[PDB]
Amino acid sequence: EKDDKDAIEEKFRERLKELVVPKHVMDVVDEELSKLGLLDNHSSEFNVTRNYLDWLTSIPWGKYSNENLDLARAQAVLEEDHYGMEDVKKRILEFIAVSQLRGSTQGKILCFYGPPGVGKTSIARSIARALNREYFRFSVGGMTDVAEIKGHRRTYVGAMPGKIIQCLKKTKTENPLILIDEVDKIGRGYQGDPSSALLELLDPEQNANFLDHYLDVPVDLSKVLFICTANVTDTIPEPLRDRMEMINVSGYVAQEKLAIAERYLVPQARALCGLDESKAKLSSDVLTLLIKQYCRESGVRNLQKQVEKVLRKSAYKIVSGEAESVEVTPENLQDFVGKPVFTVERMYDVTP
Amino acid sequence: EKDDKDAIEEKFRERLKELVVPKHVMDVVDEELSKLGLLDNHSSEFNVTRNYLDWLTSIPWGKYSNENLDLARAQAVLEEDHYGMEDVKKRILEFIAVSQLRGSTQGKILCFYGPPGVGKTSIARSIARALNREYFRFSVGGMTDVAEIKGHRRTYVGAMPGKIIQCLKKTKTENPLILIDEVDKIGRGYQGDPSSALLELLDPEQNANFLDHYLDVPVDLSKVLFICTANVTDTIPEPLRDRMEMINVSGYVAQEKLAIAERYLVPQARALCGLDESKAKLSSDVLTLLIKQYCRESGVRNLQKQVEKVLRKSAYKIVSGEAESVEVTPENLQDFVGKPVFTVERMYDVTPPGVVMGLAWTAMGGSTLFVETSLRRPKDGSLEVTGQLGEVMKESARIAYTFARAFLMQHAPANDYLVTSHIHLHVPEGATPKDGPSAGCTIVTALLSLAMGRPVRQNLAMTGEVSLTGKILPVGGIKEATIAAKRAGVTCIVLPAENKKDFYDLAAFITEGLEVHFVEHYREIFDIAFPD
Amino acid sequence: DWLTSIPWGKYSNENLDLARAQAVLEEDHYGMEDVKKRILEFIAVSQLRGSTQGKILCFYGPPGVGKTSIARSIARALNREYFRFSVGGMTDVAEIKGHRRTYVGAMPGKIIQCLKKTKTENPLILIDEVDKIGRGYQGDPSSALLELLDPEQNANFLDHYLDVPVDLSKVLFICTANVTDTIPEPLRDRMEMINVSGYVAQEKLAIAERYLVPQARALCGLDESKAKLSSDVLTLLIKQYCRESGVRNLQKQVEKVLRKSAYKIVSGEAESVEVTPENLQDFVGKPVFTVERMYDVTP
Amino acid sequence: DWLTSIPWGKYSNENLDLARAQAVLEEDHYGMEDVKKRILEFIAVSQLRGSTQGKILCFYGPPGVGKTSIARSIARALNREYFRFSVGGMTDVAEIKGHR
Ligand SMILES: Nc1ncnc2c1ncn2[C@@H]1O[C@H](COP(=O)(O)OP(=O)(O)OP(=O)(O)O)[C@@H](O)[C@H]1O
Ligand SMILES: Nc1ncnc2c1ncn2[C@@H]1O[C@H](COP(=O)(O)OP(=O)(O)OP(=O)(O)O)[C@@H](O)[C@H]1O
Ligand SMILES: Nc1ncnc2c1ncn2[C@@H]1O[C@H](COP(=O)(O)OP(=O)(O)O)[C@@H](O)[C@H]1O
Ligand SMILES: Nc1ncnc2c1ncn2[C@@H]1O[C@H](COP(=O)(O)OP(=O)(O)O)[C@@H](O)[C@H]1O
Ligand SMILES: [Mg+2]
Ligand SMILES: [Mg+2]
């Protein structure tokens, strides 16, 4: 009681006890904390600096998550989570090998580009789990403002800090896996392109000392695995392409689609629909028929919807009591998805 | 002052006892309560602390509405609340069955697209009633600000949480039903692009943790049934289309409209007008007359306004003392609505040579189309196309003209009408813009009919893209085109062979009475259009 | 507190040895004679003056040529405090000038804030991407840059918070821009244009051999004995994979080869990895440029 | 004082008749036969329903057609009290929300 100044100051001080605070950081908080002592609680300025001190203490200075450096363990996780896409797996395996030789955590900037629905975003969660890293996801599609990237001065009311600053606060570590989505369709600001601020984010030389408007102190943005997702590399800004590594995720042939659907899409859809393997069974030819005549695309996003639709209709029959078990065959496939969408492959069988 | 503040603290703490507040939320309450303890009642920031903490306590945490998981009862509610909509009802019934197998409530993203007035918004209320959920509706068409979705910053004066956050308090549950309107009508804006915010809402991975701008805490937006309504799917953004499940609601035929009006539109308008069945009577013939002459849309939105107008005049008549009871017979219908708005169902009752009826599909609904050709002048001929034709539509005319010339050489070698004459092609109603290769085969028939001087078979409507060699390509909006063709009173309809799936997906009564022909090359169209 | 924290008349002990400055500049960068000559002239003039001096310099050229990196080396050679300012896509005018003290929690501009932490009125301010500054309707910080980069008016620089003129002379202002046309004409006139041209294939080999490969090896933790990259292999990589003016693409290709070799050693595939032109395609991928002309004999 | 100033249970008689309501509208304004016919129907349905708040009436048209003066004429027709909720600027806590 009667220790509101002491309680706030002591609580803030305890936060830095378990963090490796840089010299330039805790020097700033000392002049801020001393300002709190000479400030009145009821003052409007008191609210602003208290939030600034809280934001300063929320940053995990020198906090590193215990990463996994076992090549065998990481390879098994990657193989069991996705099919194909050896190029992405090879880069991750080399990343772990480099870290083992380095002896310390490291960060890289990677960009995955390809057709929609080729598991570009899905493997980001798998990689973070394999590397034992915190996962953060946000997109820059249609983004035309710089304030969220950097922040605002403490003078302005409602000064939202940078988005990256938010990532460090919740993840409570300095080595997260931040994914930047839709970097190809970044909004070209009429008054000003926000991609200019993104250059400092993705510049490995400048990640060492990243300055944001709110915190007003550099933050070590290195040792962070930056992953970028895009569809076409042409629309990506030229300066951004230089600092980003291009990794191509190609589409799947009909043979590759069947393997993905049989091993990943169907088992996940069954769990989502709450159906057992014995209750609803989808034969290989039925899945092949769905790929050939119902989903004409490079990805498997459309195939996932069709697979779920068949199981959704099958689940209704089980609950309604029409059939204790449902088995899908090419003859009765129309009872679940209807008439085929793409009944032809080419307009001309014999060219005149 | 402290004693009054103490009571405020106690009553706020009691409210949060029932809610299952998350781990990261209770600490936010504690720090706000601590700040409320040391603040005076007259402080300006006290109101902000008092209001914001009230919002956090008002939003339910872990409270779910008691869902209904009876297939028979839910089906009965859906049937009694709406007519038709078998595809929508099937999906809802499958939604309940999946939840029954899962053993817990779950959420899904659904999209209803079709002509306005079909009942996309009304079925959402029936679904929520059947599912024992809470109904909430908001629109995003022509909306450019993203702050509306997630509110504004707390420190801003006169700032309120977003509509979704506002939804949680009014629904008082974490399992509501949210309806999004005019999704296809959203557009790109300079101030901000809400499409990115909509993508997170409809993404099952992203919506698990939703970040607002007032509460500043993640909210589990999963297990919420998201229903969105649109008119067309082409204008919907590509990333948003993937996250949404497309369900099509089509228009109603004249026999379908009467059933809706007799059972739903008339009783609802009569009830809200304070009248009863005995006092106000609306026969079937007047309802039929209203549909045929006073309405042209594919939906029943305009029909509802006409019905409400009739009851409004009937209510005024009985109140004024003209008659104790009003019967709306066809003889005195003009006293209520006036002269008929539409007197001709089709512009050409009998098509002269060079005139062929076509079919068009829009976001408004199905429509009929006519193509007129005439000799512009009495070494090389030329073709002029008029009307507000798009770039694609104008190109299809060039393809049709080239194929029509080639077809005549192999059919009537002595006929040089198409090569040695200047022909003007016009699509009437020039004010309305037109686009699409849908009328490719119609243009070929019009050119061939004019060249041969033979009128096309009466009550015949055709559609479908035509290639340079004569191949007929499938076209979209078959369901809308067929409904419009039925309204226009056509008997023979020619459709591409690849569109057979869409045509047979229609109801049995819609298909019945129509002589449909499926073709792959224009050579089959020539025999049908010109039997002799 | 803000007024007293300003280092009034505090100057760092600058390094005025030409030979020492020549050696330091060459440790981290190759070529860039025009940039190095300007720095050498800057030191020579300061020695003649007997006192510190400030200049406004702008380096322009193709991206990835070393404009930003050389700035840090220059400060180390000159023994000046290093401060970096980013103005790319920036529209906040108050970040440069400041805000009136009437506003609650008002703060000075970034230039004034830099002087406080530097604790010396003789810093080396680097401004990156002045060409793509934000010329939005909300504000025009480029117009405020004229007072910041005026050689004559820098002696009396006025900021909103302090409301007192501060001697911004004796400060070496370095500006980086990929292109010069987007720079405003009044701002272009005030700054001195220095061109940093790209590197030819012969120059890239010297950069890769002496600066890129040794830095990549330290970054990857791979010794030269374990993985060896010869001149001929490096020449082939530059010839068919890295044809751009900058060396950023070459840095990635060199890193990729060492990265692949590191995995082989870690996985136990090979105790030592030797790279040859035959095996180059396996490590780095498919060649990009293979055909130099599409007509062997012109018809 | 403000609490006691608010009336509770004190309300003037409304919707005295229909013929007098029509006569009031005809004297107040000239023309608007279609508009006056709609108002009579709105009053008639309200009398049948017995509820004052059936639905909100919105008048849209060219400026200067006397849309505002209709509400004053309407209030005299069914013996109500007229008040104008004119808004020129959209502010949350300036007009409706109030203070304290
Ligand atoms: N001559 C050189 N010797 C050694 N390293 C060099 C040389 N030129 C460039 N580099 C290296 O190339 C990389 C890119 O340099 P830097 O970031 O300074 O380029 P820039 O042209 O200033 O970039 P931008 O215009 O994109 O901001 C750095 O790692 C730098 O060390
Ligand atoms: N039908 C009418 N009969 C008699 N007087 C009329 C009539 N219409 C308009 N007036 C007169 O003209 C004046 C102008 O109309 P008024 O100011 O009410 O227009 P309004 O519809 O409110 O305009 P705005 O769209 O600009 O808000 C009225 O105050 C009234 O005196
Ligand atoms: N090889 C694969 N193995 C398992 N699942 C896959 C594979 N390829 C695609 N998928 C599935 O398809 C979906 C593709 O989505 P994704 O491509 O990540 O979206 P985006 O295109 O936005 O990145 C994922 O949810 C993933 O589960
Ligand atoms: N099959 C039907 N059964 C019952 N009522 C219907 C049916 N179809 C349409 N309606 C009525 O028509 C109206 C259509 O309006 P609404 O669907 O809200 O327009 P929109 O489709 O533009 O949202 C609804 O009020 C609904 O009551
Ligand atoms: Mg630079
Ligand atoms: Mg007015």
Numbering used by the authors:
A (entry chain D): 410 to 761
B (entry chain E): 410 to 787, 796 to 949
C (entry chain C): 463 to 761
D (entry chain F): 463 to 562
What text comes from the article?
The hexameric, barrel-forming, AAA+ protease Lon is critical for maintaining mitochondrial matrix protein homeostasis. A human Lon monomer contains a mitochondrial targeting sequence, a Lon-associated N-terminal (LAN) domain, an α-helical neck region, an AAA+ domain, and a protease domain (PD) in a single chain. The LAN domains specifically recognize and capture fully or partially unfolded substrates, which are then threaded towards the barrel chamber for degradation using the chemical energy from ATP hydrolysis. We determined high-resolution structures of substrate-engaged, substrate-trapped, and substrate-free forms of the human mitochondrial Lon protease.
Therefore, we introduced the mutation K898A (Lon^K898A^) in wt-Lon to trap the enzyme-substrate covalent intermediate of the hydrolysis reaction. We determined the structure of Lon^K898A^ in a similar manner to Lon^SE^ and the reconstruction revealed clear density for a trapped substrate in the protease domain. Furthermore, reconstruction of covalently-trapped Lon^K898A^ obtained in the presence of substrate TFAM retains the in-plane six-fold symmetry of the PDs and shows substrate density in all protease domains. After the covalent bond between S855 and the TFAM C-terminus forms, substrate threading is stalled.
